[PDB]
């Protein structure tokens, strides 16, 4: 009938004193409600009545509908939380259903209320002092302080989780035939034991927890499978996530949005394609921290877009550690890519999408590489290993690319899968000057003030041209010059430029750009048979006719 | 007995809190290795489990050195080392031997295991917190902190210094010409002795450490270097009998770049040969004036640069360029155009179709060279995307220290280093 636990030493941030927020007026009704609740709590040892000597205070609320029960006591620890030391991160990552191995028997227990049975560090209790105002300011308010982890306090989640882990350690270690996982408030217990035996282990686990004064809600009778674990519906052979309905309203509060983004973040590793535009509002919304009403705009488009994706259910299989992980990727267009990770064909563990990183100039090979890295890291998180890739790029194209690219790059074990559209190199510059090919010496210049400029070329075969330009810069004209040489030359051409800027764009080997001019150059290079781009320092005895532009 | 190894008070730099660096994802094989290593260290009292009231964290992973086959725990204390006060009197107390770079041969030994014999300031312990993550986040990470001097922490060699000197004193008094330098968990032993004699000496020194232990597992290893035969890579101009327009334009470009380093360089005469509009593949005879200028320039380049000496108060910067065909060039400097060393790497283990493994190896070689020459690691400017590098470098890392780095973008400086 006795019960013991160890407390975690807690401290306020260095240089800070406890909270001293004054208690505001409360109606006679709410006061009587609070007095009752507190009497009950004090009877269970959750709180203790203190004297007038404690200088700390945190305001208390009273709310709720009589439906479920009478009133509910709510203590706002905002100030104490700001003064409380930081704790180790409880989160850090969310378990993915496809990371689970198949188990014959599974049970999920709810330990969401057990935190209120964990004792609070004795020397920290005095900082949780609160006061219940008296009937009509005629008597000193009743003073209380917590003896257990408070509902909204900063250290409750982390202290509770570490306490639970310590209690479960001996049970798990002495029952290696069962697997125990704890996410926030759900306790997953799975095994390959016959149902009779599995139920026996569950009973023993609950009695084990009971020795520390930690109870688990009564038998929530229902048909299984499916087994519900942190939003996933677990079946013996597959798992499922039911469609996620997002709230429909025309007015949003900071709190509404935080819960929405929290739900989307969770669904992000489950569903392909999500959003982060509403975050911008949150950084400025929760920036003020105020739980007011942020006017939603444009986040409207992603919300309507997330809503559509979440309209569908997600199905997948479990992981078989005795088989290889395979990841296959497909180019969809517009810088979007899709991928499926599986072990057996058509039995996906995880499917998703990858959007290209924002940038001025890009290339399909660079994007495929990024997608591979992203998928690699995610796979290591979930399965602890890198999958074998099936990529829509020829082994020969890859070789040409990485051997010539100025940066170091690499892709892990992979095989070519012929699935259009295939990724390729659209153009390839020459390493040496082309014999017999006309040589174009190009140059450009603009007037900063007038914004007027010229771009032209002179060639070894006497060909020459100058074109006027308006509303341009030096860099603009440098690129126009190269573009002109490409337009007026044959299939093979040597181009000499003094533009380090242009050379820098082209050496990046873009096959697509946001800049109209660069895209035009790209289209031209694609049509050429051979192009050699040579650089020379400007303002010297080179080129010959740079006086024309 | 009856007297412990009283700890040394250690503190963070004024106004700085401990490190809070996120643990990066680990393969199941590394997690498994870390679990077994930490379980053993915990039993030996080297580390202890900690509660959530410790908010600090420093990343950890594991490396499998070459020819060892045994996983070695590696903690990335880069953030904590920056926040740890320099112990001047004892830390910085490790002066760098300017003569180690002039030795015929240098052997590197992993001596970090010795640090575990010394307790760590109880009030500092919390800042050494680390986490062994679990696959799929299925269980909360296992958290520990050190109770003894950790390997990889700059403060470890600083505090152990006195003990190290007492352990080696007999060896040095017998070998007054052997330069021994301690950097992090490594010990550099340089001598001009005969190879066979060098190797026997390392072994004699090896015994002292083992003999000491009245208060493994990689001590037996040894990495051999040869800083005597290390030689910078000077700037050279081509020697030809023909010379095309393209050759001359490349030459003028290179000389122009060099004129930023050597003030006397001139390209006026050579440039005059490029006045006109000729085909790039056309051969142009060198005027006598150009021939002369090229000769003058070629001479200027044989001499060292003027005004270059190492400034200990400044960071060392390393730039690396991929030259292709498994070859890599690099320069180390503190101020632009004032190189302290330039080098070139060819072949190299990993050229076996893996660019990132080659770069990772080049980074390690450059760092060790830097430790020997100046006693500190350089800040690297890497020719690679952040995402590629961060995904793969730990797969090929074999050193027990880790330098700082940042990422670069397409410089024509590559051609000039050919
Ligand atoms: Mg279901
Ligand atoms: Mg997915
Ligand atoms: Mg120009
Ligand atoms: Mg860690």
Tab-separated table of N, CA and C in Angstrom, chain A residues 8-9 11 85-89 92-96 99-101 158-159 162 165 169 180-182 357 369 373 376-377 380-386 402-410 412 432-436 439 441 458-460 494-496 500 503-504 507-508 532 534-537 540-544, chain B residues 20-23 25-29 49-57 126 131 134-141 143 245-246 249-250 252-253 256 267 271-281 322 324-325 328 351 353-356 358-359 382-385 387-388 391-392 396 408-412 415:
chain	number	residue	atom	x	y	z
A	8	UNK	N	13.215	15.195	-9.417
A	8	UNK	CA	14.246	15.814	-10.245
A	8	UNK	C	14.532	17.224	-9.693
A	9	UNK	N	15.816	17.549	-9.404
A	9	UNK	CA	16.136	18.885	-8.878
A	9	UNK	C	15.857	19.933	-9.947
A	11	UNK	N	15.564	24.246	-10.934
A	11	UNK	CA	16.056	25.568	-10.564
A	11	UNK	C	15.459	26.632	-11.467
A	85	UNK	N	14.278	27.109	-15.353
A	85	UNK	CA	15.401	26.620	-16.142
A	85	UNK	C	14.912	25.823	-17.355
A	86	UNK	N	15.777	25.674	-18.349
A	86	UNK	CA	15.459	24.881	-19.533
A	86	UNK	C	15.635	23.409	-19.153
A	87	UNK	N	14.953	22.523	-19.871
A	87	UNK	CA	15.035	21.091	-19.623
A	87	UNK	C	15.391	20.387	-20.911
A	88	UNK	N	15.801	19.126	-20.798
A	88	UNK	CA	16.122	18.334	-21.989
A	88	UNK	C	14.885	18.184	-22.866
A	89	UNK	N	15.095	18.241	-24.174
A	89	UNK	CA	14.010	18.116	-25.142
A	89	UNK	C	13.329	16.748	-25.105
A	92	UNK	N	12.111	15.887	-30.249
A	92	UNK	CA	13.312	15.535	-31.032
A	92	UNK	C	13.023	14.715	-32.305
A	93	UNK	N	11.862	14.069	-32.345
A	93	UNK	CA	11.515	13.269	-33.503
A	93	UNK	C	10.252	12.489	-33.251
A	94	UNK	N	9.491	12.268	-34.303
A	94	UNK	CA	8.240	11.547	-34.182
A	94	UNK	C	8.337	10.196	-34.855
A	95	UNK	N	7.962	9.124	-34.143
A	95	UNK	CA	8.011	7.767	-34.701
A	95	UNK	C	7.150	7.613	-35.953
A	96	UNK	N	7.700	6.966	-36.970
A	96	UNK	CA	6.967	6.714	-38.200
A	96	UNK	C	6.470	5.270	-38.141
A	99	UNK	N	8.328	2.262	-39.343
A	99	UNK	CA	9.542	1.965	-38.625
A	99	UNK	C	9.295	0.828	-37.655
A	100	UNK	N	8.031	0.513	-37.441
A	100	UNK	CA	7.695	-0.572	-36.539
A	100	UNK	C	7.840	-1.913	-37.252
A	101	UNK	N	8.215	-2.936	-36.495
A	101	UNK	CA	8.335	-4.288	-37.043
A	101	UNK	C	7.001	-4.965	-36.742
A	158	UNK	N	8.786	16.830	-19.498
A	158	UNK	CA	10.109	16.226	-19.423
A	158	UNK	C	10.369	15.428	-18.150
A	159	UNK	N	9.960	15.962	-17.004
A	159	UNK	CA	10.177	15.258	-15.741
A	159	UNK	C	9.315	14.006	-15.696
A	162	UNK	N	10.945	11.233	-18.021
A	162	UNK	CA	12.147	10.639	-17.472
A	162	UNK	C	11.801	9.738	-16.296
A	165	UNK	N	10.313	6.497	-17.765
A	165	UNK	CA	11.372	5.700	-18.342
A	165	UNK	C	12.103	4.924	-17.256
A	169	UNK	N	12.143	0.751	-16.976
A	169	UNK	CA	13.436	0.121	-17.213
A	169	UNK	C	13.535	-1.300	-16.698
A	180	UNK	N	8.415	-2.152	-25.534
A	180	UNK	CA	7.690	-1.010	-24.979
A	180	UNK	C	8.185	0.302	-25.568
A	181	UNK	N	7.273	1.091	-26.138
A	181	UNK	CA	7.625	2.393	-26.697
A	181	UNK	C	6.701	3.424	-26.070
A	182	UNK	N	7.247	4.589	-25.747
A	182	UNK	CA	6.448	5.644	-25.126
A	182	UNK	C	6.517	6.953	-25.901
A	357	UNK	N	15.007	23.140	-53.764
A	357	UNK	CA	15.377	24.227	-52.871
A	357	UNK	C	15.310	25.523	-53.667
A	369	UNK	N	20.088	14.783	-56.732
A	369	UNK	CA	21.081	14.584	-55.698
A	369	UNK	C	20.506	15.019	-54.360
A	373	UNK	N	19.810	12.748	-50.907
A	373	UNK	CA	20.308	13.044	-49.572
A	373	UNK	C	19.187	13.100	-48.549
A	376	UNK	N	17.913	9.788	-47.819
A	376	UNK	CA	18.926	9.048	-47.074
A	376	UNK	C	18.802	9.356	-45.585
A	377	UNK	N	18.808	10.641	-45.250
A	377	UNK	CA	18.688	11.070	-43.858
A	377	UNK	C	17.409	10.594	-43.186
A	380	UNK	N	17.638	6.846	-42.499
A	380	UNK	CA	18.512	6.552	-41.366
A	380	UNK	C	17.770	6.811	-40.047
A	381	UNK	N	16.967	7.869	-40.020
A	381	UNK	CA	16.197	8.168	-38.830
A	381	UNK	C	15.201	7.032	-38.499
A	382	UNK	N	14.429	6.615	-39.498
A	382	UNK	CA	13.401	5.604	-39.311
A	382	UNK	C	13.866	4.152	-39.256
A	383	UNK	N	14.851	3.798	-40.075
A	383	UNK	CA	15.271	2.406	-40.127
A	383	UNK	C	16.702	2.184	-39.730
A	384	UNK	N	17.453	3.271	-39.590
A	384	UNK	CA	18.840	3.163	-39.202
A	384	UNK	C	19.744	2.659	-40.307
A	385	UNK	N	19.364	2.881	-41.563
A	385	UNK	CA	20.207	2.462	-42.677
A	385	UNK	C	19.790	3.182	-43.944
A	386	UNK	N	20.705	3.176	-44.900
A	386	UNK	CA	20.485	3.804	-46.182
A	386	UNK	C	19.911	2.800	-47.174
A	402	UNK	N	29.471	14.053	-62.396
A	402	UNK	CA	30.312	14.197	-61.231
A	402	UNK	C	31.774	14.297	-61.552
A	403	UNK	N	32.195	13.730	-62.676
A	403	UNK	CA	33.612	13.828	-63.016
A	403	UNK	C	33.987	15.227	-63.488
A	404	UNK	N	33.038	15.936	-64.068
A	404	UNK	CA	33.301	17.289	-64.568
A	404	UNK	C	32.840	18.428	-63.658
A	405	UNK	N	31.917	18.137	-62.748
A	405	UNK	CA	31.390	19.177	-61.865
A	405	UNK	C	32.510	19.735	-60.967
A	406	UNK	N	32.533	21.054	-60.799
A	406	UNK	CA	33.570	21.681	-60.000
A	406	UNK	C	33.468	21.348	-58.528
A	407	UNK	N	32.293	20.935	-58.080
A	407	UNK	CA	32.162	20.558	-56.674
A	407	UNK	C	32.291	19.050	-56.477
A	408	UNK	N	32.503	18.640	-55.232
A	408	UNK	CA	32.562	17.223	-54.914
A	408	UNK	C	31.108	16.807	-54.726
A	409	UNK	N	30.742	15.680	-55.310
A	409	UNK	CA	29.382	15.206	-55.172
A	409	UNK	C	29.352	13.694	-55.207
A	410	UNK	N	28.332	13.125	-54.588
A	410	UNK	CA	28.222	11.681	-54.521
A	410	UNK	C	26.809	11.221	-54.258
A	412	UNK	N	24.854	7.414	-53.088
A	412	UNK	CA	25.126	6.036	-52.626
A	412	UNK	C	24.602	4.969	-53.594
A	432	UNK	N	38.562	22.152	-74.406
A	432	UNK	CA	39.594	22.793	-75.198
A	432	UNK	C	38.976	23.585	-76.353
A	433	UNK	N	39.731	24.538	-76.924
A	433	UNK	CA	39.250	25.355	-78.044
A	433	UNK	C	38.995	24.497	-79.280
A	434	UNK	N	37.908	24.801	-79.980
A	434	UNK	CA	37.513	24.068	-81.175
A	434	UNK	C	38.253	24.558	-82.397
A	435	UNK	N	38.869	23.620	-83.106
A	435	UNK	CA	39.620	23.943	-84.317
A	435	UNK	C	38.653	24.242	-85.463
A	436	UNK	N	38.929	25.300	-86.210
A	436	UNK	CA	38.070	25.634	-87.334
A	436	UNK	C	36.770	26.321	-86.967
A	439	UNK	N	35.755	32.103	-83.788
A	439	UNK	CA	36.005	32.645	-82.468
A	439	UNK	C	35.327	34.011	-82.267
A	441	UNK	N	34.783	37.213	-79.885
A	441	UNK	CA	35.273	37.995	-78.772
A	441	UNK	C	34.090	38.907	-78.402
A	458	UNK	N	33.103	40.584	-82.016
A	458	UNK	CA	33.990	40.688	-83.164
A	458	UNK	C	34.556	39.266	-83.320
A	459	UNK	N	34.661	38.765	-84.544
A	459	UNK	CA	35.193	37.421	-84.723
A	459	UNK	C	36.401	37.401	-85.633
A	460	UNK	N	37.093	36.261	-85.641
A	460	UNK	CA	38.305	36.107	-86.438
A	460	UNK	C	37.973	36.072	-87.916
A	494	UNK	N	33.734	29.249	-80.506
A	494	UNK	CA	34.609	29.586	-79.389
A	494	UNK	C	34.189	31.000	-78.976
A	495	UNK	N	33.927	31.191	-77.685
A	495	UNK	CA	33.488	32.475	-77.140
A	495	UNK	C	34.460	32.943	-76.077
A	496	UNK	N	35.040	34.125	-76.292
A	496	UNK	CA	35.974	34.702	-75.355
A	496	UNK	C	35.281	35.855	-74.632
A	500	UNK	N	33.559	37.681	-65.441
A	500	UNK	CA	33.701	36.642	-64.413
A	500	UNK	C	32.301	36.266	-63.960
A	503	UNK	N	30.825	33.766	-66.492
A	503	UNK	CA	31.547	32.522	-66.366
A	503	UNK	C	31.077	31.797	-65.116
A	504	UNK	N	30.771	32.559	-64.071
A	504	UNK	CA	30.317	31.964	-62.827
A	504	UNK	C	28.953	31.309	-62.926
A	507	UNK	N	29.572	28.123	-65.407
A	507	UNK	CA	30.351	27.064	-64.748
A	507	UNK	C	29.466	26.275	-63.745
A	508	UNK	N	28.350	26.866	-63.320
A	508	UNK	CA	27.412	26.193	-62.416
A	508	UNK	C	26.530	25.183	-63.183
A	532	UNK	N	33.061	26.300	-76.550
A	532	UNK	CA	34.207	26.477	-75.680
A	532	UNK	C	34.128	27.924	-75.221
A	534	UNK	N	35.937	30.807	-73.133
A	534	UNK	CA	37.237	31.216	-72.610
A	534	UNK	C	37.153	32.553	-71.879
A	535	UNK	N	37.929	32.696	-70.813
A	535	UNK	CA	37.938	33.922	-70.037
A	535	UNK	C	39.279	34.655	-70.121
A	536	UNK	N	39.220	35.982	-70.100
A	536	UNK	CA	40.433	36.796	-70.125
A	536	UNK	C	40.215	37.995	-69.216
A	537	UNK	N	41.289	38.511	-68.611
A	537	UNK	CA	41.110	39.677	-67.735
A	537	UNK	C	40.736	40.889	-68.604
A	540	UNK	N	42.716	45.341	-70.811
A	540	UNK	CA	44.080	45.059	-71.246
A	540	UNK	C	44.182	44.841	-72.758
A	541	UNK	N	45.338	44.353	-73.200
A	541	UNK	CA	45.550	44.116	-74.615
A	541	UNK	C	44.953	42.821	-75.132
A	542	UNK	N	43.676	42.588	-74.847
A	542	UNK	CA	42.999	41.379	-75.303
A	542	UNK	C	41.737	41.737	-76.098
A	543	UNK	N	41.209	40.768	-76.844
A	543	UNK	CA	40.004	40.992	-77.624
A	543	UNK	C	40.209	41.843	-78.861
A	544	UNK	N	40.652	43.083	-78.662
A	544	UNK	CA	40.878	43.981	-79.782
A	544	UNK	C	39.866	45.109	-79.847
B	20	UNK	N	24.331	23.363	-26.713
B	20	UNK	CA	23.022	22.774	-26.902
B	20	UNK	C	22.923	22.422	-28.379
B	21	UNK	N	23.744	21.462	-28.786
B	21	UNK	CA	23.800	21.039	-30.182
B	21	UNK	C	22.995	19.775	-30.376
B	22	UNK	N	22.163	19.786	-31.400
B	22	UNK	CA	21.312	18.656	-31.715
B	22	UNK	C	22.116	17.446	-32.189
B	23	UNK	N	21.691	16.272	-31.732
B	23	UNK	CA	22.308	15.005	-32.106
B	23	UNK	C	21.854	14.699	-33.527
B	25	UNK	N	21.223	12.117	-36.850
B	25	UNK	CA	20.825	10.714	-37.036
B	25	UNK	C	22.010	9.757	-37.165
B	26	UNK	N	21.863	8.574	-36.584
B	26	UNK	CA	22.932	7.574	-36.617
B	26	UNK	C	22.445	6.252	-37.185
B	27	UNK	N	23.332	5.531	-37.864
B	27	UNK	CA	22.951	4.239	-38.388
B	27	UNK	C	22.796	3.282	-37.239
B	28	UNK	N	22.031	2.213	-37.443
B	28	UNK	CA	21.851	1.251	-36.376
B	28	UNK	C	23.180	0.662	-35.928
B	29	UNK	N	24.115	0.524	-36.860
B	29	UNK	CA	25.418	-0.029	-36.534
B	29	UNK	C	26.215	0.887	-35.606
B	49	UNK	N	24.585	8.340	-16.138
B	49	UNK	CA	23.292	8.759	-16.661
B	49	UNK	C	22.846	10.046	-15.989
B	50	UNK	N	22.061	10.852	-16.704
B	50	UNK	CA	21.598	12.131	-16.162
B	50	UNK	C	20.120	12.339	-16.421
B	51	UNK	N	19.507	13.229	-15.642
B	51	UNK	CA	18.088	13.494	-15.783
B	51	UNK	C	17.811	14.622	-16.751
B	52	UNK	N	16.531	15.004	-16.930
B	52	UNK	CA	16.102	16.071	-17.835
B	52	UNK	C	16.429	17.463	-17.340
B	53	UNK	N	16.900	17.555	-16.102
B	53	UNK	CA	17.263	18.859	-15.568
B	53	UNK	C	18.584	19.348	-16.187
B	54	UNK	N	19.194	18.533	-17.059
B	54	UNK	CA	20.431	18.919	-17.759
B	54	UNK	C	19.978	19.216	-19.189
B	55	UNK	N	19.953	20.500	-19.587
B	55	UNK	CA	19.515	20.889	-20.933
B	55	UNK	C	20.592	20.843	-22.023
B	56	UNK	N	21.839	20.646	-21.605
B	56	UNK	CA	22.963	20.623	-22.528
B	56	UNK	C	23.111	19.357	-23.373
B	57	UNK	N	23.762	19.495	-24.517
B	57	UNK	CA	24.013	18.361	-25.381
B	57	UNK	C	25.088	18.687	-26.401
B	126	UNK	N	28.209	18.696	-16.151
B	126	UNK	CA	26.961	18.873	-16.861
B	126	UNK	C	27.100	19.379	-18.292
B	131	UNK	N	23.897	12.417	-25.961
B	131	UNK	CA	22.752	11.549	-26.103
B	131	UNK	C	22.950	10.456	-27.113
B	134	UNK	N	17.803	6.863	-30.483
B	134	UNK	CA	17.233	5.561	-30.788
B	134	UNK	C	16.656	5.616	-32.195
B	135	UNK	N	16.608	4.469	-32.844
B	135	UNK	CA	16.066	4.407	-34.175
B	135	UNK	C	14.572	4.756	-34.147
B	136	UNK	N	14.129	5.489	-35.161
B	136	UNK	CA	12.740	5.872	-35.325
B	136	UNK	C	12.155	6.617	-34.124
B	137	UNK	N	13.017	7.086	-33.235
B	137	UNK	CA	12.552	7.844	-32.071
B	137	UNK	C	11.621	7.024	-31.201
B	138	UNK	N	11.749	5.700	-31.277
B	138	UNK	CA	10.851	4.810	-30.561
B	138	UNK	C	10.992	4.863	-29.045
B	139	UNK	N	12.170	5.254	-28.574
B	139	UNK	CA	12.425	5.376	-27.141
B	139	UNK	C	13.192	6.667	-26.912
B	140	UNK	N	13.109	7.240	-25.705
B	140	UNK	CA	13.856	8.480	-25.484
B	140	UNK	C	15.358	8.183	-25.476
B	141	UNK	N	16.154	9.115	-25.984
B	141	UNK	CA	17.589	8.901	-26.023
B	141	UNK	C	18.213	8.677	-24.665
B	143	UNK	N	20.828	9.374	-21.985
B	143	UNK	CA	21.670	10.527	-21.704
B	143	UNK	C	22.763	10.325	-20.666
B	245	UNK	N	46.835	31.313	-79.423
B	245	UNK	CA	46.158	32.483	-78.871
B	245	UNK	C	45.566	32.062	-77.532
B	246	UNK	N	44.957	30.891	-77.506
B	246	UNK	CA	44.386	30.387	-76.285
B	246	UNK	C	45.443	30.225	-75.183
B	249	UNK	N	46.354	33.575	-73.781
B	249	UNK	CA	45.273	34.178	-72.999
B	249	UNK	C	45.222	33.531	-71.627
B	250	UNK	N	45.503	32.229	-71.564
B	250	UNK	CA	45.494	31.533	-70.270
B	250	UNK	C	46.681	32.016	-69.457
B	252	UNK	N	48.204	35.004	-69.688
B	252	UNK	CA	47.976	36.375	-69.228
B	252	UNK	C	47.011	36.359	-68.038
B	253	UNK	N	46.029	35.467	-68.096
B	253	UNK	CA	45.076	35.378	-67.010
B	253	UNK	C	45.792	34.959	-65.749
B	256	UNK	N	48.150	37.701	-64.452
B	256	UNK	CA	47.331	38.770	-63.905
B	256	UNK	C	46.957	38.402	-62.466
B	267	UNK	N	52.483	41.991	-67.710
B	267	UNK	CA	51.875	41.291	-68.839
B	267	UNK	C	51.710	42.168	-70.072
B	271	UNK	N	50.469	40.760	-73.535
B	271	UNK	CA	49.132	41.237	-73.899
B	271	UNK	C	49.125	41.792	-75.318
B	272	UNK	N	50.194	42.491	-75.699
B	272	UNK	CA	50.291	43.059	-77.038
B	272	UNK	C	50.123	42.000	-78.125
B	273	UNK	N	50.441	40.753	-77.793
B	273	UNK	CA	50.327	39.654	-78.745
B	273	UNK	C	48.873	39.270	-78.959
B	274	UNK	N	48.018	39.654	-78.013
B	274	UNK	CA	46.591	39.342	-78.074
B	274	UNK	C	45.730	40.488	-78.619
B	275	UNK	N	46.390	41.524	-79.124
B	275	UNK	CA	45.672	42.651	-79.701
B	275	UNK	C	45.298	42.237	-81.113
B	276	UNK	N	44.006	42.063	-81.335
B	276	UNK	CA	43.544	41.649	-82.639
B	276	UNK	C	42.400	40.687	-82.446
B	277	UNK	N	41.974	40.062	-83.533
B	277	UNK	CA	40.864	39.132	-83.472
B	277	UNK	C	41.248	37.843	-84.176
B	278	UNK	N	42.064	37.035	-83.514
B	278	UNK	CA	42.513	35.793	-84.114
B	278	UNK	C	41.818	34.562	-83.568
B	279	UNK	N	41.882	33.489	-84.348
B	279	UNK	CA	41.305	32.228	-83.958
B	279	UNK	C	42.058	31.747	-82.690
B	280	UNK	N	41.318	31.201	-81.735
B	280	UNK	CA	41.907	30.710	-80.489
B	280	UNK	C	43.000	29.637	-80.687
B	281	UNK	N	42.835	28.787	-81.696
B	281	UNK	CA	43.802	27.707	-81.965
B	281	UNK	C	44.956	28.133	-82.861
B	322	UNK	N	38.824	20.946	-56.382
B	322	UNK	CA	38.755	19.654	-57.044
B	322	UNK	C	39.341	19.863	-58.451
B	324	UNK	N	39.985	17.191	-60.483
B	324	UNK	CA	39.555	16.097	-61.335
B	324	UNK	C	40.602	15.000	-61.382
B	325	UNK	N	40.197	13.811	-61.803
B	325	UNK	CA	41.107	12.679	-61.871
B	325	UNK	C	41.696	12.380	-60.509
B	328	UNK	N	43.561	16.994	-56.032
B	328	UNK	CA	43.066	18.129	-55.258
B	328	UNK	C	44.205	19.068	-54.875
B	351	UNK	N	39.498	7.373	-54.390
B	351	UNK	CA	39.373	7.819	-55.780
B	351	UNK	C	38.504	6.794	-56.494
B	353	UNK	N	35.780	6.069	-57.305
B	353	UNK	CA	34.467	6.612	-57.617
B	353	UNK	C	33.744	7.369	-56.501
B	354	UNK	N	34.476	7.937	-55.544
B	354	UNK	CA	33.835	8.676	-54.444
B	354	UNK	C	34.543	9.991	-54.102
B	355	UNK	N	34.016	11.079	-54.675
B	355	UNK	CA	34.502	12.446	-54.499
B	355	UNK	C	34.492	12.932	-53.067
B	356	UNK	N	33.394	12.668	-52.372
B	356	UNK	CA	33.227	13.105	-50.984
B	356	UNK	C	34.195	12.402	-50.040
B	358	UNK	N	37.091	11.390	-50.972
B	358	UNK	CA	38.403	11.937	-51.273
B	358	UNK	C	38.572	13.280	-50.555
B	359	UNK	N	37.537	14.117	-50.623
B	359	UNK	CA	37.593	15.422	-49.962
B	359	UNK	C	37.768	15.246	-48.451
B	382	UNK	N	35.192	24.508	-48.114
B	382	UNK	CA	34.950	23.319	-48.919
B	382	UNK	C	34.154	23.460	-50.214
B	383	UNK	N	34.661	22.877	-51.320
B	383	UNK	CA	33.999	22.909	-52.642
B	383	UNK	C	32.933	21.779	-52.666
B	384	UNK	N	31.820	22.018	-51.999
B	384	UNK	CA	30.777	21.017	-51.929
B	384	UNK	C	29.579	21.662	-51.292
B	385	UNK	N	28.406	21.095	-51.551
B	385	UNK	CA	27.155	21.569	-50.983
B	385	UNK	C	27.032	21.071	-49.543
B	387	UNK	N	24.577	20.112	-47.739
B	387	UNK	CA	23.757	18.918	-47.613
B	387	UNK	C	24.483	17.643	-47.988
B	388	UNK	N	25.334	17.688	-49.003
B	388	UNK	CA	26.039	16.480	-49.396
B	388	UNK	C	27.037	16.161	-48.311
B	391	UNK	N	25.764	14.883	-44.911
B	391	UNK	CA	25.147	13.570	-44.998
B	391	UNK	C	26.191	12.458	-44.956
B	392	UNK	N	27.358	12.722	-45.540
B	392	UNK	CA	28.384	11.697	-45.674
B	392	UNK	C	29.730	11.756	-44.978
B	396	UNK	N	33.465	8.575	-43.455
B	396	UNK	CA	34.859	8.390	-43.837
B	396	UNK	C	35.850	9.040	-42.897
B	408	UNK	N	31.738	26.648	-50.201
B	408	UNK	CA	32.076	27.558	-51.307
B	408	UNK	C	31.249	27.524	-52.603
B	409	UNK	N	31.593	28.418	-53.556
B	409	UNK	CA	30.986	28.500	-54.910
B	409	UNK	C	31.785	29.057	-56.116
B	410	UNK	N	32.011	28.146	-57.054
B	410	UNK	CA	32.708	28.268	-58.326
B	410	UNK	C	33.686	29.394	-58.638
B	411	UNK	N	34.955	29.200	-58.264
B	411	UNK	CA	36.020	30.179	-58.491
B	411	UNK	C	36.943	29.804	-59.662
B	412	UNK	N	37.338	30.781	-60.500
B	412	UNK	CA	38.232	30.420	-61.603
B	412	UNK	C	39.658	30.246	-61.079
B	415	UNK	N	41.957	26.911	-62.110
B	415	UNK	CA	42.843	26.767	-63.259
B	415	UNK	C	44.254	27.265	-62.958
